[PDB]
Amino acid sequence: ATFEIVNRCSYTVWAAASKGDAALDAGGRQLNSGESWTINVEPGTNGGKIWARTDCYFDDSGSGICKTGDCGGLLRCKRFGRPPTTLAEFSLNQYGKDYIDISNIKGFNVPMNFSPTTRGCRGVRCAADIVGQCPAKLKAPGGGCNDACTVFQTSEYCCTTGKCGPTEYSRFFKRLCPDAFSYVLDKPTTVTCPGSSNYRVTFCPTA
């Protein structure tokens, strides 16, 4: 399957693509404002994620660091990024269907639209001004809006014990972006698409 990643933001972003235990395609690449990059994702890929990284600096060796979404200080990501990261998530060819969604469980850094380029289903978007409305305690020093688990590190927000339910911090994200996951046990907002569909992830989608 093909995933076209387009940066429509006025600022440069360093795109990232990984499945947690490995990089997807090149794993990462600098995307100037108005630049697009298409990656190939093997069918059957489960737990894949695509995100943007902001305020980065990398040298010709591939080493560097980013203020949001850093993945082990590498340009070509092999692991998931450090919050805050708006996430495009997908599992392909699952019983003949693809499953996609956007998640704020690891925070929010850049607005995003995640839509198929082929017929059969609809897209998902979270482009509300979450950073501009970010709760005081979730405001991230290097930009973006952190999730509550990253900040407080308690079961109430991290969902590590029995209970775990919606909180004031998860509701912050959910209210602004109802079609995105706001916490671990949030009611699924996943979209079911035909198997082997193609997609486009757009950073800073326009109205």
Residue with tokens 């599992």, as numbered in its chain: 91
E-assigned strand segments in the chain: 2-7, 13-18, 23-31, 36-40, 48-58, 64-68, 87-94, 97-103, 112-116, 124-126, 180-181, 191-194, 199-203
53 class by beta-carbon count within 10 Å (0-12 exposed, 13-18 middle, 19+ buried):
buried
Experimental method: X-ray
Copy the structure tokens of residue 34.
């108005």
CA distance 84 to 139: 10
Q: Please enumerate in sequence order all residues whose Cβ is within 8 A of that of 50, keeping only pairs 6 or more positions apart, or say none.
A: 3, 5, 15, 16, 17, 24, 87, 88, 90, 114, 201
35 class by beta-carbon count within 10 Å (0-12 exposed, 13-18 middle, 19+ buried):
middle
CA distance 119 to 48: 21
Selection from 161, 157, 159, 160 nearest residue 171 by Cα: 157
**Domains of the chain and CATH, by start:** 1-207 (2.60.110.10)
Instruction: Give the chain's length.
Output: 207
Helix then strand count (H, E) for the chain reads 3, 13
Q: Please enumerate in sequence order all residues whose Cβ is within 8 A of that of 203, keeping only pairs 6 or more positions apart, or say none.
A: 5, 6, 7, 8, 9, 13, 15, 31, 52, 110, 111, 112
Copy the structure tokens of residue 42.
């093997």
Copy the structure tokens of residue 69.
């979404």
CA distance 207 to 7: 15
Copy the structure tokens of residue 43.
């069918």
Q: Are strands 13-18 and 180-181 parallel, antiparallel or unpaired?
A: unpaired
